[model samples]
Target: AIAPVITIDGPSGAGKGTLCKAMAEALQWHLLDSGAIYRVLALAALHHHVDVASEDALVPLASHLDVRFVSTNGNLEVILEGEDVSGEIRTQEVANAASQVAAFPRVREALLRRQRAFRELPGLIADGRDMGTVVFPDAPVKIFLDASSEERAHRRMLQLQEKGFSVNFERLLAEIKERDDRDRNMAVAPLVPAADALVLDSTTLSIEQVIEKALQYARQK
Candidate 1:
């Protein structure tokens, strides 16, 4: 039998990252931050001077991209093309570029095998835009976590502030909404729950509450 998987999928800043991290720690499972792959791709494009708007250019880069994830001192570091890009790719610019490239069908297809390779061993906690619906359709446990746009914006603002980046709340909110629209309306792997997924709206729920509820549901199922 294949090892079981738990997929947490949602739009950007919807608490999926925290939930997936907590779940991975609690269950001692491998974790896949699929968005990071796209982010890395974006950084690669920038580094190699590839035009982000050109699908043909991105396909080649996507196919033979040199990237690695190293865990050092309890932190994950992403390296691309013999250079560490962990810090570079997390910037707002790279993130926006990632979303743009991620919208291309060819780009997403090219990264499919790389993403699926993360599903190995005991189990995996896959996190990303279409983790449940596209990447791991047969995953035993699937969750579509969501929150109000305003709430997500607020969370994002605080997160950026914690990172020491001053952010305007209204601008952040607008950008979040814009990205959400693109992700949701994309032709390939639009951000939506799989048919069997348990949709969890965390707008008014605490982190512990969501985890407890998800664990109970997972165990019962």
Candidate 2:
């Protein structure tokens, strides 16, 4: 039998990253950071000058994406075309481009197969905007982690501040709102909780609290 999967689906700044990491550590499971796949794809497209507007141009790129996810000292490193792109793909510019590239149905479909390959022994923990509803619909434990836009924006601002970047609250909130709109409205694999997923609103919950709640629910399921 294939190993079971635990899917954590949610919007950005909803603490999916922290929750997924904790879950993986607690369960000793492999981690699939699906968002990084798209970000890497976006970075690859940019490096190659492929037209993001053309699905035909992107399908091949998505299929042949030469990217690797390497874990070192508990941190994931993203490599594209033999070069480290972990930091580059995290930039806001690449993030916006990833959102654009992710809108195409064919592009998403192309990446689906690649994502599925991460499912292997001991189990897997999938983290992404569509993990529960689209990527791992049959996952035994699925969670839809969410938070208020303002709350998420606040968290993101602090996170950036820690990384030594100055941030403007209002502008960050607006951008987050805009990305949320596009993600929810996209025709292909739009972000939504699976029918059986446990929806956890972390707007007021601490990281440990969220992880505790999720672990309890997952064990029960």
Candidate 3:
């Protein structure tokens, strides 16, 4: 029997991560952080001094990238090239690089199979910019979670602060907007809701509320 999948696609800082995690826990399904694939490619390029914008240069790297996600004490540890880069890949530098590399169609294509490989028994909750629209078009349930840039920026600031990273709200807002624009305007698999997807604007909803709505929708479907 084929494993079921729930796809959650949206722009950055839209609470997709939290929502997907909640759904994964509730359903006892495997989870895939598709954005991390892009992040890993970006980190690999940066570490190897490859051009982030060069499709030719990134395609090979994307096809044979040495990366792993190991679960340790209930936490995910990102390993790359035999080295753990779990923490390093979350920095602003890696994020910006990811956004840039993700814009390449070839790079995205190369990673498609890798992303699909995460879909295993009994179920999967996939999260990323194109989880529904591109990677898992046949997923049983799809959600497009969104929020206003200002609110997302505020939430991001709080997250960073909690991690002991000082952030400027204004700067973060601008960066968020910049990344959103790029992700939305990219030629291939631009971030958008699948026509059949349940679009939830979580601009005013709490994380729990969003998860509740998503679960209700999934159960209904």
Candidate 4:
């Protein structure tokens, strides 16, 4: 029998990570951070100096990606090619490259089965731009979580501050919009909500309120 799935599809800095993780923890289900998967694959390409511009070179790497997500304590350690890349894949360069890599139709197809395999015995909370629209179309619950670009940039600036990296709000907002365009305009597996998804605008909601609201909706569904 197939395991159940709840999908959270959204752009960056929209709290998909925090909320899906909390739901997964509460429900004792597996959590698949699909964005991280793409980042890991991009990291591999960069590490091996594979030509990201060539779909021919990327397809093999995508199909044979040697990456693992180890849940150590409460943290997920992303390992690629037998080396720890938890910190490596989080860079903006890696993110941009992943967006490029993810745009290829064949590359997305290569990762499709692997993403689906994350569904486990109990259930799964899948997180990414296309989790609801592409990866898990039959999922019972789907949420399209988002916020205003300025609000998202503010949250992002705070996040970067915690990590000691800095970016001005305007620059960050432009970056977010650029990423959104890439995701939304992609030819395959574009960033869009599943038709039945609940669209939540969190521009005025607190993090706890966001969690409670999503949880309540999921419960209702």
Instruction: Evaluate all candidate structures by whole-model CA lDDT and list the values in order.
Output: 0.82, 0.86, 0.83, 0.84
Please report how far candidate 3 places residue 96 from its true position, in Å. Answer: 1.1
- List CA RMSD, all candidates: 1.5, 1.3, 1.4, 1.3
lDDT accuracy of residue 160 in candidate 1: 81
Positional deviation of residue 46's Cα in model 1 after best superposition, in angstroms: 0.5
* Residue 146 local lDDT, model 3: 91
lDDT of 2 at 136: 79
RMSD of 2: 1.3
Candidate 1 residue spans exceeding 4 A from truth = none
Enumerate clash totals for all models, in the order shown: 0, 0, 0, 0
Identify the superior model by lDDT, candidate 2 or candidate 3: 2
Which candidate leads the pack in lDDT? 2
lDDT of 1 by residue, 1-221 (tens): 56888878887777888787777878878878888888999988987899989887898999998877774257678888888888888988998788777878789888988778877778888888787778898988888888889998987898888888989889989988987787676767777788999998888898888787777766566
Q: So what's the TM-score on candidate 3?
A: 0.95
Compute each candidate's TM-score over C-alphas: 0.94, 0.96, 0.95, 0.95
In model 3, which range of ten residues has the least summed lDDT? 68-77
Clashing pairs in 1: none
Q: List the candidate 3 regions with Cα displacement exceeding 4 Å.
A: none
Displacement of the residue 39 alpha carbon in candidate 1, Å: 0.5
TM-score of 1: 0.94
Cα lDDT tens digits, model 4, 40-136, are: 8888888789988888888999898888788736578888888888888999789788877887889988898888888888888988888777788
Candidate 4, residue 75: Cα displacement in angstroms equals 1.5
Candidate 2 residue runs with Cα over 4 Å from true position: none
